[PDB]
Structures are given as C-alpha cells and as structure tokens.
Symmetry: D2
Subunit: 433 residues, 4 copies
Amino acid sequence: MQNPIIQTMYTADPAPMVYNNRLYVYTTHDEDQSTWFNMNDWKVYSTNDMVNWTDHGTILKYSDFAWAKGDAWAAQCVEKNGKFYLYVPVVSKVNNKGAIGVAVGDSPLGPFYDVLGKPLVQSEWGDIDPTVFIDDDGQAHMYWGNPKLKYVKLNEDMISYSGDIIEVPMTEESFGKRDGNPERPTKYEEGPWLYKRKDLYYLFWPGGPLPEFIGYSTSKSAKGPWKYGGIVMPAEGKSFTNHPGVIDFRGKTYFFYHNGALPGGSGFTRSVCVQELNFNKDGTIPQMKMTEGITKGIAALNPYQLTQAETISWSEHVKAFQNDKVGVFVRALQNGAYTSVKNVDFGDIGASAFSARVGTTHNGGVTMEIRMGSQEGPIAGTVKVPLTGGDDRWEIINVKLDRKITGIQDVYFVFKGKASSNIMYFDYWKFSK
Amino acid sequence: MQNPIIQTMYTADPAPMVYNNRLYVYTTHDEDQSTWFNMNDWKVYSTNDMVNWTDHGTILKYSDFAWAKGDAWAAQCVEKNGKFYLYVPVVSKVNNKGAIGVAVGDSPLGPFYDVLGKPLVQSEWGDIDPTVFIDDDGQAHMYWGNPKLKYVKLNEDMISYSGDIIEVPMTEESFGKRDGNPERPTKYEEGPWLYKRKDLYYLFWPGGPLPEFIGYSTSKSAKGPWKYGGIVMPAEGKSFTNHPGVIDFRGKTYFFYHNGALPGGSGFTRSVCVQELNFNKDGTIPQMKMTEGITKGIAALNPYQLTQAETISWSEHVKAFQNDKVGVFVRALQNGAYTSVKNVDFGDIGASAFSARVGTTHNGGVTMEIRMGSQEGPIAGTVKVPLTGGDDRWEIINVKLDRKITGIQDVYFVFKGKASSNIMYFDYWKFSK
Amino acid sequence: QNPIIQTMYTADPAPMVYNNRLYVYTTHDEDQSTWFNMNDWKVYSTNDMVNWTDHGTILKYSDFAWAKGDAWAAQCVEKNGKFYLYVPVVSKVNNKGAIGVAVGDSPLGPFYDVLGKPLVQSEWGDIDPTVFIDDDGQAHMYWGNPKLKYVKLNEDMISYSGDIIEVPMTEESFGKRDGNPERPTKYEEGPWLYKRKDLYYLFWPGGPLPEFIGYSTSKSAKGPWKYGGIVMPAEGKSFTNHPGVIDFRGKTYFFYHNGALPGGSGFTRSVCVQELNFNKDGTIPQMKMTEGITKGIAALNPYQLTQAETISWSEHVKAFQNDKVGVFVRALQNGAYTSVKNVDFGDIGASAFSARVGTTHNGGVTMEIRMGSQEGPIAGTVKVPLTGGDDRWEIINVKLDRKITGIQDVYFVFKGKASSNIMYFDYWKFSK
Amino acid sequence: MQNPIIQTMYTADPAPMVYNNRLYVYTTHDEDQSTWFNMNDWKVYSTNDMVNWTDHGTILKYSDFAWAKGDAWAAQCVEKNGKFYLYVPVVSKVNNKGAIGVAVGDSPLGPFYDVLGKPLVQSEWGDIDPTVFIDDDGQAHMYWGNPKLKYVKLNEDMISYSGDIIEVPMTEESFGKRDGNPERPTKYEEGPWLYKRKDLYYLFWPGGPLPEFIGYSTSKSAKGPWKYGGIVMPAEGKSFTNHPGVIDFRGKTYFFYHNGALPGGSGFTRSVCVQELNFNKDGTIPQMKMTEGITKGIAALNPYQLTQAETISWSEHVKAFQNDKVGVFVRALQNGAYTSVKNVDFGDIGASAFSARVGTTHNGGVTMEIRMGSQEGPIAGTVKVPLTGGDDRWEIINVKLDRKITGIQDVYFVFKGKASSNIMYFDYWKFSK
Ligand SMILES: [Ca+2]
Ligand SMILES: [Ca+2]
Ligand SMILES: [Ca+2]
Ligand SMILES: [Ca+2]
Ligand SMILES: [Ca+2]
Ligand SMILES: [Ca+2]
Ligand SMILES: [Ca+2]
Ligand SMILES: [Ca+2]
C-alpha cells in the first residue's frame, strides 16, 4: 500500500517542508517496544515522486541541546534564504519543564546546531508542539502549546522574538466546544499547524477529548482571529494521538498525519501517513477518513543511478539503521522480508546488469531476489550475499540478469536466508544497461 | 558460582590470569543469534571469591588492529612487571589469512593497544589460538595453531620472537591417535594451553575428530618433547567446540572451558564455565565430566561497598551492556528476571538502608525487590524505579529497609514491571549501616 | 581580495554551482608543513563573490578504509541533487595512487565511500581527477601525472565501461617542453574540463616547475585536444598552481592557488579567484594574478544569523570546528580581525547586535564592531566573558552606540591583554 | 635538577597514591598559554624508581560529570580493595558554585565514572580541594574547603556521608595567625591533605596571605582537634600557589608540591615537583626549601622491555599527546629536543639492537640519536625516522647499535631535523640483546 509511508521505524508528528523541488518530512521517532513516550531524536525523509520515500536518518537529537533532559517531541523545520530553522520542544534540565529550542542548519539534512544554548521560549507550563510560518510579507509567526495555545511574532533572525507571549483566547467560536473540562474549554488539544491557501489562513490542530481527531480553524490574517472550520479527520485506528502537517507540492496539497497501523503499532509506536487534501470551492475542507494514500507517482525513479536501500515505497519485516561508514542502511529481520520501489523507468533500451552493497552474518544460504510487480512476481535476478561478519563490513555484488528489463516497473527486493532473525543488510543498489 | 559462570552474554575460549590476588578470565564474545562464528571483541571478567564474577566489558576489539579483517578468536593475556600482553588471533586484511597480533596495556582492564601495527607472527596457514607462558627462568614460550601445532621462543620484550617457527612433530606418542585423517594424524585439534605444576609442564588442547573433547600432554621442558596424557574432559553438551584454560589461584587449580548451556546456547552461542582441576599424586589428571562448578565461595562479598549490577553469581533473563557514561550495566529482559550474588557478609550490626542506580523506559509499575536466599525468598526491601527515558539517563534510589539484615546471605535482585520486555536497567548497588 | 580564504591553508580549488550558490571544494595543507601534509577536504561557499562561508571538513582520507593518506586535488559534481566527489588517495593495498568516489545528498555531505575500493587504479600517476557531465547527459573523467588519462563513466557516476585511454602526449595538443622524455609536452598534471558555447576547454598545470596554467581546446569533451596557450604564468611563493573554472550568474571565474598568506609556501598554499576573460573567438589571453573580485554581486543581510566563518578578509584568525557549534574562528593574537563586505543595513538601520563568543582569559577581552576598516569608527564593543574553552560559549547582546545604515563593510576586531588565543567567535546578527 | 618531575605539560595539585608497589600521582592540568586557571581534565603519572615518570594521559575530565560547568581543580584518589575513588572539585551547572564529586574506577588508570550524577557534597560556599584518608580501623574521613576548612565522616561505601558538614574551628592554636582578613583568621588558605605517620595525624595545607606557603597541623585523631605545627615550606619561585601531597613509598616519605619552573611557567602554567620529607624524632617537621629532587633512583629501569617514550626523567622542548590508536606519545617541538631516562641497567651481556615506534611529517632529514650520559654524550646509534604523514600514522624502526651497551646508563633520545617545528613523534622503544 502507500500508508504508512515509513515502515522501517516508528515515526510520528510529521512536519513537511519543500526545498528546491524536493519534499521533505521531519518526524519524531518512537523507540521500538515503547509502552510510554520514548522519543529521543528527530528524523527527516524525502521524496521526488510521492510514492518512494528516502530515509535520511537522524538529523538532530535531544542531547544536541546541552540543556535538554529528554522528550524530543513534535518539531518543524522552515527554510529562509538557504538556511533551515528547526524548532523543537524538549524538557529543560534547568527547571524540569517543557521549552522550545531552535537549531539551524545549512542543508535540509543539517548538520543542525543549537544556536542559543538555552530555550527560544519557555512559558509557565505547556511549551510543546511549535509551528512556524513565514508570510508573503516576510514576517514569521510561531504558534504552540498544550493545553493553552500561545503565539509570538518572530524577529527576522528567526531565533528570537520581541513583544510578549500572547495567549490566544480559547473561544468556542475559534475552536469549537468540548464538554466537561475546565482546563480545556474548546476542542483544541495541542499541535497547531499554520498554513495558507489563496487568501485564507488555516490552523490545523489535534482535538480532544481523546482519542484525538484533527480539526481546523480559518482566519484572514496569520495572527487571527480564528474561526472554527470543523473536523478534518475523525479519530480512527490504534493511535490515540494524531498530528497534522499540511503543505503544497507541485500544485497539490498534502495532509501528513500518523496512526498505529504498523505491526506492533500503538499510541506509543506510531507511523507517519500522507494523503491528498481536497478543498471545497469556498475554501472549506470536507471531513475525510484515512485512505491508502497516493496511488500514482508524480515522477519516475531512475534505476540507472545509485538508489538507496532506504528509499522505500512499501516493505515488510525490514528495519532501518545507520552508521558513520555507509550512512543509512536496512536490515531484513526474517526470511521473505522485502522492500519495494514504485514507478521505476527502465526505459526502452533496458537493464542487463545489477549492482548492490550488501552483507550478512550467516555462512551460506543468503540470497536477495530482484522481482517485478509484487513480492511473488517474476524473478529478474538473484544476488548471493557474502558473509561479511557484521554491518560494519560490506561487499558489492555485480550480477548479470536473466533477462533485460524495460519500461515502467515496480521493483521488489526479497531477502532470503536460513536464520530466524537478521537475514542480511542492504545499503544501495543500481542497474546498468 | 554454578555453571555457566557468565549468563549475561555468550562467551567462549576462556583465558585466565592472576594479578595482585584477583583472578581474571579473558574471553571471546559470540554475538547474539549467531548461526556462524560472529566474534568481534574480547571481554574480561574477574573474581575475588570464585562464585561472584564482575563483568568488565569490552577491553579490545578486532578493529583496534588497523590491519585486521575480523574474526576475534581465542586470545590469552599474560602479565610481567605490571604490563599486560594480550595475544590475539585475527584474520589479516593484507592477505585474507589468519595471523597472531599482540596488544599491550598497563592494567588488566587496559587500555590495550596494538604495539606492532602488523602481525606478531604469520605463517602459511592456521594461525589461531595462541598460548603464552613465562617460565621460572623468565623465558617466554608461545604455542598456537590449527591444524599444525607451532611454537616460538619469545624475546624478553614479549612482542617479538627469536629464531624460526617450529612445527611440533604431530606424533601419536605426543598427542594420541586419530583414525585415518590425512590432515590430522593425532587427537590434537587446536587451542593449546601451556601450564606448569611442580616439576611438570602440561599442554592442554581441544581434540578431535569432533565433537571436541579436551586432552593433555606432559613434558619436562616447556619446549617439549610432549607425551600424551589422556582425556581431561570428554565431549558433552550443545557446543561442538571446547576450549581450555588452566590456572592456580590461592592454592587450588581451576579448569575453565565453555559449553552451550544458556538458553539459546549452541556452538556459536557458547558460555564459559569453570570447575576445580584435581591431580593424581603422580601428576596425571583423572578424566572428569562437566559439573555444577564451585559449590562454596572462598571469600565473602562486602555489601557495604559499591557493588556492580554486573557482579553476578547466577541470573535469568538479564543481558549486559555498556556505555561511556556509566560503564557496564545490566538490563532485565522480562518480568521476573533476576540477578544474585552469593556469600554476602552483612556482619553483626547489619544493614538498614539500600542504594541503587537504576532506570526504566516505562511509566509506573516498575520495582526491584531485594530478597534473601532465593528469587522467592523473604523481601528485605523494594525500590521504585523511576522513568528516566533510556539507559543513557539514571537516578540513584535510596530506601530504608524494613528488615535489618545480618550474617551471611545470598542476595537476589528481582526486576518487576507491567511491560513485556526491557523492564529496567541497573548499574550498581550498596547497603548502609 | 585574494587569497579568498585566510583562516587555513587551502589548495587545489574545485568550484561547483548548486541552486544559485557557488561552492569551492579545496584540499587542506596542514599548518607548518615542509612537505605535502594533506589529510582532509573542505568546502566553502558564496552568494556574492566577496564573502566566503567556511563549511568545515566534509571528507577525510580515512573515510576510505583502503586509503593510506595524501588527500590531494578533488572535484565534486552534482546530478539530480546527488553529489559525487572524486578524490585521489594513496591506497594501502599497493601503496600507490588511486581515484575514489564518495556520494552525498547535499553539497555539505555527509559523503560516503560507495565502492570500498578505487573507482580506478592504473600503473602509475593516479592523481588529480576532473569530471564533466556533457549536454547529452554523458560524463567524462580525466586525470593523471605524468600521463593524462581518460575514461568515460556510466550514468551511475561510480563506474566506467570502456578502457583506460592514455591521451596522446603531443605538442599540437599540449605544447612543447624540451628535456624530460617522460614529459614531452607542457602538461604536468591537474586537468580541468569546462565548456563554453561551442568549445570545450581542458585547463592544466604545466611545467617545468614552477607551474603555470595552460589550456587546450576541443570540439568534443573526449578530444582530440589542441593547444591553446598560457592562461597564467608562474608567480609568487607556490611552485604549484591548480585551476578550477566555472560559470556563475553570467560570468566565468578562474580559481587557482598561491602562497600569499603569512607563512605561505608551496606546502602552505591559499586559494584565490579572479574573473576569466575570453577573446571573441574563444581563446584566452594570458593574465597575471590580480587582487580578485573588487565588487560583490549581491548584498549580505546583517539581520539574519551570519557565521563568524563567513569572511571576506581577515588577519591572525584561524578556523576550527566541533560537533556542538559547528565551525567557529579563533583570534590568535591582538589585532586579529575578520571583515565582511557589501553589507546592506538599509534606511532605518541596526540598533542592537548579538554574538556567540567566549574566551579562556579572565577579563580584558573585547570585540570591536567597526565600519569600513579595522581602524574605522566603533559602532559597539562586546565584552567577551570567560567561558573556560571553546567547548563553552555565551551570547552577548549589545545596543550600538549609533544606528548603522546603508551599505557597509563590517570589521570585527579582537582585543585582549594576552599573548595568544584571544577569543573564539561562532556567529553574529544585528537587530533593527 | 630533578624537579619539576614532569616537563611535557603543565601539571599542578599533586595527589600521590600507592597501589601494588607502584607510586602514582594524580594531577590537575594547566592548559598551555594560560593567563588564568584553565583546567579541564585530570592526569595520572607513575613511577617504579622515583626518577623516571610514566605519563598515563587523561584519566578523567570535568565533562564526565554531566552536572559540571568546569574548573577541574585539585583532586585526590584513594584505593580500597582494588577499587579507586577519585574525589574532585568542580563548579556545578545547577547553581554555578563549587561542589565535590566522586568518580570510581577498577584500576588506577580508570576508566573512572561519576557514580552519583550529582555532588557528593555541596555547602553554602567554598567547595574545593578535597582530601580523603582511610584510617587503620577502616573508617574514612574527608576534609576540604576555601576559605573555611570543613570535615565529614564518610560512609564505608566512600560515596556518601553520615552526619553533618562540620566547620572546623578556625583557631590560631590549630592553624596560626594571619591578621588583616576576617574571613581568614588563621594561616590556613585551602588545599588540606590528611596523612598519618606512626601515632600522629598530619594535616598539610597551603597558607596565606599569598604568595602561598605550606604549613601543617598535628593531632592524635583524624577528626581533630588540630595543633599548629609550623611552616613546612615557605613561598618560593614563580607560582603564587603551592599545593601539598604527602605519602610513604618503600620506607621513605615524599612531599609532592608544584611551582612555576618550566619554560613559560607561571601561577597558571605550573609544574609538579617532589622531594623527600624528613621528620624529627618527635614527629615534627623541619622547615625546608625547594630542592632539586631525588638524586638517586631506588630501582633500575629494564631497557629490554617495551618502555614508553612518555616515561621520562628529564626532557627539553618535548610535549605529550594522546590518541586512541597508540595511547600517549611525545612530540619534539624543535631540533635538538630530547628526553632522558635514568638508572637504566643494560647488564653484563648488553644491548646490540634498538627498536622504536616513531614518525614524522617531514620528507627526509629526521634522525633520533641514542646517547649516553647527556644530550652531547657518546652516540650509541642513530635512527632514521620515516615520513608517515601525521601522528595518526606510525612505523617501527629496528637498528643495530654501533657499539654494545652494558651496565648502568642514563639514556638520552635526541630528536634532530631541518625544520623549524614539530620534528617528529615517538611512542615507545626497546633494546634487544
Ligand atoms: Ca507540529
Ligand atoms: Ca544507504
Ligand atoms: Ca587459548
Ligand atoms: Ca555498573
Ligand atoms: Ca583538480
Ligand atoms: Ca559558526
Ligand atoms: Ca590536594
Ligand atoms: Ca606511548
């Protein structure tokens, strides 16, 4: 399928960003086997085609802020003049309560560094979930907060504010009515996201009472006042939280969210999803359910280039890792695990050779099958994966294919071996004419 | 004590060494879930009492030799004038064949460094399993090899050798008879260990045709000639290999070996064991089978001093880890996991308080019970383990015991929680009067 | 001004344009070298041709597990937002030169060895690769000293299909030198492949030493080549010169190196750049070393975070980096300074200033913000606090003695009472 | 001049400790070119003979305490049952004031870990310069403080305390009279050191007003009360501080201190010194001035074992460094720099060959001369140092000596090259028969 878009790790709280005709999504990371929020670092993924997502690994950690105690929660990255500002909530060590920090990088992949050495903003309590938006006039605005929605106008430097922290009036006209809660007069729960289309500003937000849904408000200007719009997406699935990120890419609008749809998924082991966001003619948004996502890619993938093992459309029983020597790589966790890429254009001439960086800890009996169409589709080639000792050691295997491959294909790599776990590790692949 | 003596890791190829009235055993490390030999680094454990073993973690890695390809196999550390020489077999990258290197350190725990930058010795083939022995006259001897037993006279510097590589005559007189195996004329397989008692030198060795047993030879000189002695220990258990280390400690002789007796144990997931070695009055060794090991501690453990969580007699469902912040620590893998230490002397006054450095990733419901005698014995105290976020973050918990503890006790630490895995992590403990 | 980088010894410049920013990858001569001591590669970037951002080390010889050392002249090329860095290193396997290739997903890396072995290794002289992707999408690699070699690379950019071609070392193609049968032509090493209109150019260091820069032209990227002439004679304190040529925003630039920094030499070099002029027929007249770009092609915005290591001209400053703050600069002695050119404060102007700074000295350490030159009027003084070492930092906010308006050159002068290591400086910004 | 004992780095605040018949000194480290106290990490050096000192490198840093802001000041390590407790003063980040922490390790070289994650003790102000002493009955005592001398009884576990922080009565019968300062009523300034000899306890301490001298007090009990003894050593030389460490080794007592006697030395670039401490028959101490140290080694150095380049008696124009590959090594900063080792026993047969691990960044012209007696003494051999590229690359050079060397010698290694700086680097050496 196409949702969740990442299956190699538990991801949540998606925050998209476009730079130079590429779509990135920054995410939080739920540790495996969590029964509570175990969130320590932030990830970024990217796509050129909306069906294949490249895993770029960790780009920031809570410990990159020397004053942070933990809790790497929902963040957002925005770009301006080739610099990338990543706004993050963390619990501070100084007073043991939430705060918003900011790191800055010169690429979407970083490296990102704490430029303040202290919080950008810390209130009385409830300093989580920042969203930042740069308007057409160049003015930058930040909203955040749980339980209270707060607002500040950011300076041009993007790393300070002047003025006060504005507590947005929690009105039933602005955010709807919840009943039976005085800490929470409205449906607003947390996680604001500020977006613009035509002449209208949108504030998307998780709403309560739990399990969370996604609601929205509208306004004529970025600073409010806000107008309740309705429910964008009702509560659904195994994750009691949902968290929105909305963005335009190549003339369409996309709605990122998360759920608990992976094996072992839950409210503490979530997974990021995406589907198209459709507007009515007046600019309102119809209620939508969780769908299977993007069914058709908007561009082809070139198989005659180095393509990462961690550029994945759909997979099962594969996890992602990284190290300093090769970067991000994937490991097959059991026999018959697979990765797939969609909309691969082998062209008219066709591919006759194939190369891959691979390895295994097992002595014999490890293969990777290149198949077309599905995990049981026709076999184009089989790679014998050599013993390397561990994922710090790798070999490149070049094979001639049983038959030249042409045209548009979906390519499946199936990993086979005699062991019960850790069948092999896979870094990148390529085809040759 | 009980066997295996290490249950928090798969360990093999034990190599004991005495320094300053403490007994150390250096071991290889079988990675979890191995179906082939996956061995990357070397460990050292130590004891003061023969029943409680301290895990000192990794003290050397194959990659600490820049010319090594992998295969961190059976090693031995010897001491001379406060310097420690660890002889290791590794496969070389230069020629893709085995070689013997040597690292030197200034404590039993290192740090250890490759002092040559190249092999100490490399022959034509089968350069594995070194043993090194310093005679009463101060002369050092090295044996090694599979299939051919090889010998060199080491120089005083211990990191070079004099003369030629001697191939020891593989005669039935020296090592017994194996049935038509052109390549293996004798029972000798690999893994020599040179030991001295009274006026007699012993060479212990794994023998084939396999499953492996332990045989021995004797001589009047450390260079030989060697005369076949008999079977020290027949093949037994789930490991097709066995590997001996013999040494005197406080007037008794101990026989270290390995088997496959841990859960998930096998020939590639082995576990180190020890039992006493008894001699006949003429110096020969009566054959023995694998026993429970050490029944009685030769010294008490002081509970009023800092004692490591990784100082363990017997345990279940505990694994050991390390990092640079706290060193070695242990993790409980499921509810009802436990560690135990034997022969703890609380004295006549007794313990009234307890302290422990611990943490968990779970939110509530995590306790560690201190019990006496067994994992089901009387509860002396309970520790509430707080949420810290991950094993990079820790708290110290101080509790007053309801029951004062006196006299000699066996202390069990039982780890309890509501989650199905990774209950908590544990670094050290101590009692107060 | 030239050299364009003064905070380290840099050499073998290899420019590259990505998304309207101009990068230059360089090699790194260690301080106090009496021989080639070259271990890692750097990348700098500009928006304006007068201020250069130091992005730090982006690759090391040791990132190739098979390399013994000698991180020499490299080039990075981009294709569909992936970046391929072709590097010469000495291999441990046979103790001779080889070309490797690393790949990254931004100009700043991270870059990883994707082969685990050389991309190419011949019998001898495997140094100084240049790579060019033609209009038809096909990529060409040249390299070599003493023999110019060529292969055509596949699209994957990390392999080649045909044979290693030894380009004929003829006078019609590379000029004539007499003596040295092993060097029949002026060609010495360091080829650079560039295209302008209908003509391909191969620039190269020429001998005998001290090196000059010559060029050849061709109608195809694969040759055959025809000698053009001398682009730049030998001059100054570096017996090597190494060319990189590129178009940026409608002009052509010639990167090279010399030994013009204090302590400079043939083993402590410094990268330079000046505009490259062509004749109407596409030939190149001889040019000498100039003072470089006299005017910036864009303004610098002082109201955004600006790195201390974004520098036009400086004295007695060195660059460093760590994982906590990234790249930063240290003032090595009193009267060290950095400067940035063509800064647009606008009509209203700046009233406040912030810098991340620190020092190891107890009192007496200041950084002066001055306009126009290092002796120009003082807009503000920053008292730099004791932090203990460049692992610890403080942000200092000041109000300016007067508002700053219009286009300015900004000088940051570092002062203290000690003999060395006055302070360290990470970034700054102004506020309205 | 055998003082200072360490010339390859600026060292201060010596704290000796004996373990298994070897003498260690833990020191603070003054960064080069300091005009203020720039102190970040702790060092340990060791000797077998009182004339040659081995550099063991950094064994702990301020940053190994996650709560420390900086100022790695005067520390002391004590041993008990093969565990080593290192008490350090650092400034806490929580409140920006001084605190005492404690790290624990399992060898004198570490690794050492903060076992509390917080201060062992923090008072209102003055938390520097701890000394710890374990008495004959096994109870441990801690003194510290500036300006106020403070005391606590440590628990058996050595990482906690009993009762209250005791402010020792700052009396003139106990610590003499100053006059002029209300916060300094007595000569006591800081830096206490608790020592025992026969039935008398001694507390040594820096005294003021500055420049600091060393005075002492006596008692019959470790906890006091204290009786002023007199001045042990008046202020002298270029360091306005002095800091005492006193200890017995092989039947003599040694007084460690520091001064500013190296090139570039000062109050912020200090150097550790040692000389013998003499007592009168009644246990009082005659006043002494700075001497040039130990004139004769109490044991010979064996040149036929691996000997570190950083085992040095006297040197000029040499600095010490370290990395993970080789450990500690030395660099000659200019032509004619040298190291020296004293009392080296080549024996009756003698050395005929020499080996050394070395390298240089220069292309040709680099030699290392082995000389006897002095840096201009007879040349036994010359080693051509090869180009390696940097101190991350090394070669071993073996040479035949021009003449055999026999008997007791002082060995000088002189580093020569044509360059103006950084001639070469040197890791270890050894002779062969
Ligand atoms: Ca968000
Ligand atoms: Ca990869
Ligand atoms: Ca062995
Ligand atoms: Ca521990
Ligand atoms: Ca080049
Ligand atoms: Ca910076
Ligand atoms: Ca002291
Ligand atoms: Ca050394």
